[PDB]
Short mmCIF file of C-alpha atoms in Angstrom, two decimals:
data_model
loop_
_atom_site.label_atom_id
_atom_site.label_comp_id
_atom_site.label_asym_id
_atom_site.label_seq_id
_atom_site.Cartn_x
_atom_site.Cartn_y
_atom_site.Cartn_z
CA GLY I 1191 160.28 117.82 -43.14
CA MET I 1192 159.78 121.60 -42.76
CA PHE I 1193 155.90 121.31 -43.83
CA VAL I 1194 155.49 118.44 -41.74
CA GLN I 1195 156.55 120.49 -38.62
CA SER I 1196 154.69 123.76 -39.66
CA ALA I 1197 151.36 121.29 -39.58
CA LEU I 1198 153.12 119.24 -35.83
CA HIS I 1199 153.88 122.81 -34.56
CA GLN I 1200 150.10 124.06 -35.52
CA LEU I 1201 149.22 121.06 -33.38
CA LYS I 1202 150.96 121.69 -31.02
CA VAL I 1203 149.74 125.41 -30.33
CA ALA I 1204 146.48 124.46 -30.22
CA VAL I 1205 146.87 121.53 -27.92
CA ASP I 1206 149.15 123.65 -25.30
CA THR I 1207 145.94 126.63 -25.40
CA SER I 1208 143.80 123.70 -24.42
CA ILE I 1209 145.61 122.49 -21.92
CA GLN I 1210 145.75 126.12 -20.42
CA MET I 1211 142.22 127.01 -20.99
CA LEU I 1212 141.17 123.62 -18.97
CA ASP I 1213 143.55 125.03 -16.41
CA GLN I 1214 140.33 127.86 -15.84
CA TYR I 1215 137.71 125.78 -15.41
CA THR I 1216 135.86 123.09 -12.23
CA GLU I 1217 134.37 119.89 -13.51
CA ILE I 1218 131.64 121.05 -11.95
CA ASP I 1219 132.03 123.84 -13.95
CA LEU I 1220 132.54 122.44 -17.31
CA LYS I 1221 129.08 119.84 -16.17
CA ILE I 1222 126.38 122.34 -16.01
CA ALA I 1223 127.11 124.95 -18.76
CA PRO I 1224 125.78 126.29 -20.97
CA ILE I 1225 122.66 125.77 -18.30
CA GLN I 1226 120.16 126.17 -21.69
CA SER I 1227 121.50 123.88 -23.90
CA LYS I 1228 121.66 120.19 -25.13
CA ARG I 1229 125.37 119.64 -24.95
CA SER I 1230 128.01 120.73 -22.32
CA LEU I 1231 131.26 121.96 -22.05
CA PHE I 1232 133.00 118.49 -20.23
CA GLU I 1233 131.32 116.60 -23.07
CA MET I 1234 132.80 118.50 -25.33
CA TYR I 1235 136.32 118.62 -24.57
CA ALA I 1236 136.26 115.36 -23.21
CA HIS I 1237 135.93 115.03 -26.94
CA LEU I 1238 138.82 117.55 -28.50
CA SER I 1239 141.02 115.40 -26.10
CA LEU I 1240 140.54 112.40 -27.82
CA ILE I 1241 140.82 113.84 -31.34
CA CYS I 1242 144.73 113.70 -32.16
CA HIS I 1243 144.48 109.28 -31.15
CA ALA I 1244 140.59 108.64 -32.29
CA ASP I 1245 142.29 110.26 -35.76
CA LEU I 1246 145.35 108.80 -35.60
CA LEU I 1247 143.67 105.18 -35.35
CA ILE I 1248 141.42 105.65 -38.46
CA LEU I 1249 144.29 106.88 -40.57
CA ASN I 1250 145.69 104.03 -39.23
CA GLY I 1251 143.07 101.64 -40.75
CA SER I 1252 140.64 101.55 -37.56
CA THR I 1253 137.35 100.44 -37.82
CA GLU I 1254 134.18 101.78 -37.46
CA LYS I 1255 132.92 99.65 -34.39
CA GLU I 1256 136.15 100.53 -32.71
CA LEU I 1257 136.47 104.44 -33.26
CA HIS I 1258 133.16 104.11 -31.66
CA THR I 1259 133.86 102.48 -28.46
CA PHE I 1260 136.66 104.30 -28.12
CA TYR I 1261 134.97 107.71 -28.50
CA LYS I 1262 131.91 105.46 -26.04
CA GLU I 1263 134.03 104.02 -23.51
CA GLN I 1264 137.69 105.28 -23.62
CA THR I 1265 136.78 109.64 -23.02
CA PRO I 1266 138.28 111.09 -20.17
CA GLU I 1267 136.29 112.08 -16.78
CA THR I 1268 138.89 114.41 -15.25
CA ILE I 1269 140.30 117.54 -15.91
CA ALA I 1270 143.62 115.85 -15.51
CA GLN I 1271 143.48 112.73 -17.74
CA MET I 1272 142.24 114.84 -20.57
CA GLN I 1273 145.42 116.97 -20.60
CA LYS I 1274 147.37 114.03 -20.13
CA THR I 1275 145.68 112.47 -23.27
CA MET I 1276 146.03 115.39 -25.31
CA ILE I 1277 149.47 114.85 -24.60
CA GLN I 1278 150.07 111.55 -25.25
CA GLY I 1279 148.81 111.84 -28.10
CA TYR I 1280 150.35 114.39 -29.48
CA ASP I 1281 153.24 112.79 -28.62
CA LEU I 1282 152.31 109.78 -30.62
CA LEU I 1283 151.27 111.81 -33.87
CA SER I 1284 154.15 113.55 -33.57
CA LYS I 1285 156.70 110.34 -33.00
CA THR I 1286 154.23 108.85 -36.03
CA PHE I 1287 154.62 111.64 -38.62
CA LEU I 1288 158.02 112.34 -37.70
CA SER I 1289 158.72 108.57 -39.09
CA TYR I 1290 157.58 109.01 -42.17
CA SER I 1291 159.70 109.62 -44.91
CA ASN I 1292 158.02 111.47 -48.15
CA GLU I 1293 156.31 108.12 -49.57
CA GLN I 1294 154.79 107.18 -46.84
CA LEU I 1295 153.55 110.79 -46.25
CA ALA I 1296 152.25 110.22 -50.05
CA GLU I 1297 151.01 107.44 -49.54
CA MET I 1298 147.14 106.60 -49.70
CA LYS I 1299 145.17 105.75 -47.20
CA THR I 1300 140.89 105.27 -46.75
CA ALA I 1301 139.08 105.84 -43.07
CA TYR I 1302 136.68 103.87 -42.69
CA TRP I 1303 134.13 106.19 -44.40
CA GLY I 1304 135.68 105.64 -47.98
CA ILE I 1305 136.95 108.72 -47.92
CA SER I 1306 140.58 108.36 -49.08
CA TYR I 1307 143.25 110.94 -48.15
CA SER I 1308 147.21 110.45 -48.00
CA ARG I 1309 148.80 110.87 -45.33
CA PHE I 1310 149.73 114.43 -44.81
CA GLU I 1311 146.48 115.06 -45.65
CA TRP I 1312 145.46 113.35 -42.96
CA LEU I 1313 147.75 115.73 -40.31
CA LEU I 1314 146.20 118.72 -42.27
CA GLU I 1315 142.76 117.06 -41.63
CA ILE I 1316 143.61 116.18 -37.62
CA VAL I 1317 144.41 120.49 -37.83
CA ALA I 1318 140.96 121.20 -38.66
CA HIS I 1319 138.73 118.59 -37.32
CA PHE I 1320 140.88 119.87 -33.86
CA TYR I 1321 140.23 123.28 -34.74
CA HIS I 1322 136.79 122.80 -35.59
CA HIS I 1323 135.91 121.46 -32.70
CA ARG I 1324 137.46 123.64 -30.57
CA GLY I 1325 135.69 126.93 -32.15
CA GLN I 1326 132.56 125.00 -31.26
CA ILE I 1327 133.86 125.03 -27.45
CA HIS I 1328 135.46 128.84 -27.81
CA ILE I 1329 131.95 130.07 -28.94
CA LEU I 1330 129.98 128.27 -25.78
CA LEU I 1331 132.77 129.39 -23.18
CA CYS I 1332 130.39 132.51 -24.36
CA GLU I 1333 127.40 130.14 -22.30
CA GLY W 1363 153.87 120.78 -54.24
CA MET W 1364 151.45 118.00 -53.30
CA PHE W 1365 152.13 119.59 -49.56
CA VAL W 1366 150.43 122.85 -50.61
CA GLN W 1367 147.45 121.00 -52.93
CA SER W 1368 146.85 119.75 -49.56
CA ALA W 1369 146.26 121.88 -47.66
CA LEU W 1370 144.07 123.97 -50.17
CA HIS W 1371 142.13 120.80 -50.82
CA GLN W 1372 141.38 121.02 -47.10
CA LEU W 1373 140.43 124.83 -47.23
CA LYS W 1374 138.43 124.08 -50.25
CA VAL W 1375 136.34 120.97 -48.35
CA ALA W 1376 135.78 123.87 -45.55
CA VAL W 1377 134.78 126.61 -48.59
CA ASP W 1378 132.09 124.25 -50.55
CA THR W 1379 130.96 122.57 -47.16
CA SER W 1380 130.45 125.60 -45.71
CA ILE W 1381 128.19 126.77 -49.52
CA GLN W 1382 126.61 123.63 -48.70
CA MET W 1383 125.27 124.11 -45.14
CA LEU W 1384 124.72 128.16 -46.33
CA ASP W 1385 121.59 126.75 -48.25
CA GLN W 1386 120.50 125.10 -45.33
CA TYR W 1387 118.96 128.71 -44.60
CA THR W 1388 117.61 131.86 -45.47
CA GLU W 1389 118.99 135.19 -44.53
CA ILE W 1390 115.88 135.68 -42.17
CA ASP W 1391 117.09 132.80 -40.44
CA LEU W 1392 120.37 133.38 -39.60
CA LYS W 1393 119.21 137.32 -39.53
CA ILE W 1394 117.37 136.19 -37.12
CA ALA W 1395 118.65 133.46 -34.63
CA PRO W 1396 118.53 134.78 -31.09
CA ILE W 1397 122.68 133.65 -30.35
CA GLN W 1398 123.32 135.84 -27.38
CA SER W 1399 127.02 136.89 -28.71
CA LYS W 1400 127.46 140.39 -30.21
CA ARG W 1401 127.01 139.61 -34.07
CA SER W 1402 124.39 137.53 -35.52
CA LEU W 1403 124.68 133.89 -37.35
CA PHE W 1404 124.25 136.30 -40.48
CA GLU W 1405 127.71 138.58 -39.79
CA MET W 1406 129.41 135.59 -38.66
CA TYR W 1407 129.06 134.48 -41.97
CA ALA W 1408 129.41 137.16 -43.21
CA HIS W 1409 132.99 137.21 -42.00
CA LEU W 1410 133.31 133.79 -42.46
CA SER W 1411 133.41 134.60 -46.41
CA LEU W 1412 136.13 136.90 -46.07
CA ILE W 1413 138.71 134.66 -44.59
CA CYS W 1414 140.79 133.96 -48.19
CA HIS W 1415 140.77 137.31 -48.82
CA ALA W 1416 141.42 138.72 -46.03
CA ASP W 1417 144.57 136.47 -44.94
CA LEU W 1418 145.32 136.86 -48.36
CA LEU W 1419 145.71 140.23 -48.14
CA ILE W 1420 147.27 139.88 -44.22
CA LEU W 1421 150.08 137.25 -46.37
CA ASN W 1422 150.77 140.55 -49.10
CA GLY W 1423 151.47 142.89 -46.37
CA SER W 1424 148.70 144.81 -46.09
CA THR W 1425 148.33 147.22 -42.92
CA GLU W 1426 145.16 147.11 -39.90
CA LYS W 1427 143.65 150.40 -40.88
CA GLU W 1428 143.36 148.71 -44.83
CA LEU W 1429 141.86 145.45 -43.21
CA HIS W 1430 139.66 147.76 -41.68
CA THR W 1431 138.12 149.57 -44.38
CA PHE W 1432 138.45 146.09 -46.32
CA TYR W 1433 135.72 144.16 -43.82
CA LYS W 1434 134.28 148.25 -43.64
CA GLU W 1435 133.50 148.32 -47.13
CA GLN W 1436 133.40 144.71 -48.71
CA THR W 1437 131.14 142.83 -46.19
CA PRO W 1438 128.62 140.31 -47.48
CA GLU W 1439 125.28 141.52 -47.08
CA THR W 1440 124.00 139.35 -49.06
CA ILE W 1441 124.18 135.05 -49.03
CA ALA W 1442 124.89 135.15 -52.30
CA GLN W 1443 127.27 137.62 -52.84
CA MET W 1444 128.70 135.61 -48.97
CA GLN W 1445 129.13 132.31 -51.49
CA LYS W 1446 130.57 134.12 -54.54
CA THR W 1447 132.73 135.63 -52.47
CA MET W 1448 133.87 132.79 -50.80
CA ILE W 1449 134.37 131.16 -53.76
CA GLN W 1450 136.67 133.42 -55.64
CA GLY W 1451 138.75 134.60 -52.22
CA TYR W 1452 139.78 130.22 -52.00
CA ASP W 1453 140.22 130.71 -55.98
CA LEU W 1454 143.07 133.49 -55.21
CA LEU W 1455 144.53 131.99 -52.12
CA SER W 1456 145.29 128.99 -54.43
CA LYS W 1457 146.23 130.50 -57.45
CA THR W 1458 147.82 132.68 -55.45
CA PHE W 1459 150.01 129.35 -53.80
CA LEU W 1460 150.27 127.49 -56.39
CA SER W 1461 152.07 130.12 -57.71
CA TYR W 1462 154.97 129.64 -54.91
CA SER W 1463 158.00 127.37 -55.26
CA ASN W 1464 159.47 125.82 -51.73
CA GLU W 1465 162.19 128.79 -51.44
CA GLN W 1466 159.11 130.83 -52.09
CA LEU W 1467 156.72 128.74 -49.68
CA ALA W 1468 159.68 129.14 -47.00
CA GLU W 1469 159.88 132.81 -47.17
CA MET W 1470 158.78 134.93 -44.01
CA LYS W 1471 155.92 137.43 -43.80
CA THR W 1472 155.20 139.39 -41.38
CA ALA W 1473 151.66 140.38 -40.74
CA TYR W 1474 151.08 143.81 -39.74
CA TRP W 1475 150.64 142.89 -35.84
CA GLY W 1476 154.29 141.67 -35.88
CA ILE W 1477 153.87 138.13 -35.63
CA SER W 1478 155.34 136.51 -38.82
CA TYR W 1479 155.54 133.05 -40.58
CA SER W 1480 156.70 131.25 -42.95
CA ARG W 1481 154.05 131.47 -46.16
CA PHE W 1482 153.74 127.66 -45.65
CA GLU W 1483 152.74 127.77 -41.77
CA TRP W 1484 150.42 131.20 -42.64
CA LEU W 1485 148.65 128.82 -45.46
CA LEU W 1486 148.13 126.68 -42.18
CA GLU W 1487 146.63 129.06 -39.90
CA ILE W 1488 144.06 130.34 -43.15
CA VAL W 1489 142.98 126.07 -42.78
CA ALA W 1490 142.74 126.53 -39.19
CA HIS W 1491 140.97 130.00 -39.09
CA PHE W 1492 138.89 128.65 -40.88
CA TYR W 1493 137.75 125.76 -39.67
CA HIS W 1494 137.61 127.46 -35.83
CA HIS W 1495 134.90 130.10 -37.74
CA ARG W 1496 133.72 127.43 -39.29
CA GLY W 1497 132.99 125.70 -36.06
CA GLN W 1498 131.80 128.64 -34.34
CA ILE W 1499 129.33 129.12 -36.89
CA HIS W 1500 128.02 125.34 -36.70
CA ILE W 1501 127.92 124.71 -33.12
CA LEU W 1502 125.00 127.86 -32.94
CA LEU W 1503 123.18 126.39 -35.87
CA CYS W 1504 122.45 123.35 -33.90
CA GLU W 1505 121.48 125.37 -30.96
CA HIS W 1506 119.15 128.08 -32.50
CA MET W 1507 117.74 126.58 -35.65
CA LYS W 1508 118.14 123.42 -36.94
CA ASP W 1509 120.89 120.92 -37.48
CA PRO W 1510 123.06 120.73 -40.53
CA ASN W 1511 125.00 118.72 -42.79
CA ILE W 1512 128.50 117.92 -43.27
#
């Protein structure tokens, strides 16, 4: 209640800041940068936008192949769809987590790779996952 | 209780993995790495090791001046004291959060910079802070050094 709302606010601020950060760049600019590097800001922001959706799928028993296919084929191709995807993912994650009782928040769920967490801890893992990837992007925004 | 243990476990996963990631490099690897940014991978890892302690001091009403002195005089100068500091900070942070009642978890505290959070909200900010900073380090490692393993 108090705890789930706190965790969802933490995530909303992260998403809301990522959306406004995407307004300060063009698709070309993100595709180029960094100049001398193996990774691109576009591909990383694209991956960031699918975190909420993807981690919710993992929590809801999705297989390894579904997640592979999801990230491979469903990655956004424009900044606008990146932003829309983050909002959608947040919305579905919020509506999911706001529908859980304490028993459901306490329920153990195993990811396809074997680690088992409570649903509540999964919400926290999503927060960690999003902030991690956002940290990677942040340092590379300094070229 | 269950919610606090969940938050501390995510923090501990970050701590343990940062300690394992830190063993894949030497003091020379971190100091010598090119980067481009104002501070070295060593300096950033030393900062990372102080997050649990610093953010707990912030929660407990520490002034800006005290944090500036804290970072000035307590930032690790070796990978051993980075690991020791990060574990000790986690222990102090967890022992503290596990001592709090629900009422205490809901209590509002103002950081020196004037923004206020509940104690539980601030714990989630520590988690976000640690993963953000661990992510900055992680990508700099993949970019200018060998790729580690989480």
